[PDB]
């Protein structure tokens, strides 16, 4: 298929295969059997028909694919080229986490429906896997103000690693 | 056309104006230290020509 079990994840299925225990015809099957037959199949051979027209004339596409570029760590200051590429890399970068966080969205938003009211047991680990994605994006990306730049994403983990090491030399006094 | 156009284009809009920005920045150094030391083309304001003063003896002398 074109998407995944890795990124897009999906429990297996399981059906209670009915078996009546009244002799009444079960009328739900019968109707969809029916709804097969007169929707199901003409739509079906109709898009039979755009498959085949399709794979009679097909073009491709690629990953528009991009390189590293040195960042604002490495960037010198006032030096507005590598400024402004590291700007665009950083900024992809921040789409990139918005674009995953959206996938950990939906992940876990599905699953909540899918594993029913058994939900707040089989999506905890994706919870799980949640309540790890936002505090490390609010570590990565977050306050950023309205403007937010790469420096200023560079200040805000300048102001990580200071508090992160200013508590382990209060560890260690 | 392609983003390449555009990200070429504008590097080179963003190294045109900071070797113009620097540059104004140098200026106002440069026009004010050549306003108060003076030692420079500009700015030098003028004096009296020596060409105008007489050297050929006078009259009465130590003059």
């Not at chain 1, 994605?133 to 300048?158: E, I, M, N, P, T």
Request: aromatic share 10%; glycine share 2%.
């Amino acid at each position: 298929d074109s998407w995944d079990k890795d990124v897009y994840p999906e429990p297996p299925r399981r059906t209670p295969a009915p078996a009546p225990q009244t002799s009444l015809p079960n009328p739900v099957t019968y109707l969809t059997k029916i709804f097969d037959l007169l929707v199901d199949r003409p739509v079906t051979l109709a898009r039979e028909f755009i498959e085949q027209q399709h794979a009679k004339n097909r073009y491709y596409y690629y990953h528009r694919e991009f390189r590293r570029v040195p960042d604002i760590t490495e960037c010198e200051e006032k030096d507005i080229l590598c400024m402004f590429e590291a700007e665009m890399q950083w900024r992809r970068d921040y789409k990139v986490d918005q674009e995953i966080v959206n996938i950990i969205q939906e992940r876990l938003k599905a699953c909540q429906q899918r594993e029913g009211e058994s939900y707040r047991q089989n999506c905890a680990k994706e919870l799980e896997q949640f309540t790890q994605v936002s505090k490390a994006f609010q570590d990565r990306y977050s306050d950023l103000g309205a403007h937010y730049s790469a420096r200023k994403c560079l200040a805000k983990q300048k102001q990580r690693m200071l508090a992160e090491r200013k508590a382990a030399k209060e560890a260690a006094a | 056309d392609g983003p390449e156009k555009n990200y070429e284009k504008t590097m080179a809009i963003l190294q045109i104006e900071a070797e113009k920005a620097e540059l104004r920045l140098k200026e106002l150094e440069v026009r004010r230290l050549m306003r108060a030391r003076g030692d420079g083309p500009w700015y030098q304001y003028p004096t009296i020509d020596k060409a105008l003063i007489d050297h050929s003896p006078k009259t009465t002398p130590d003059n």
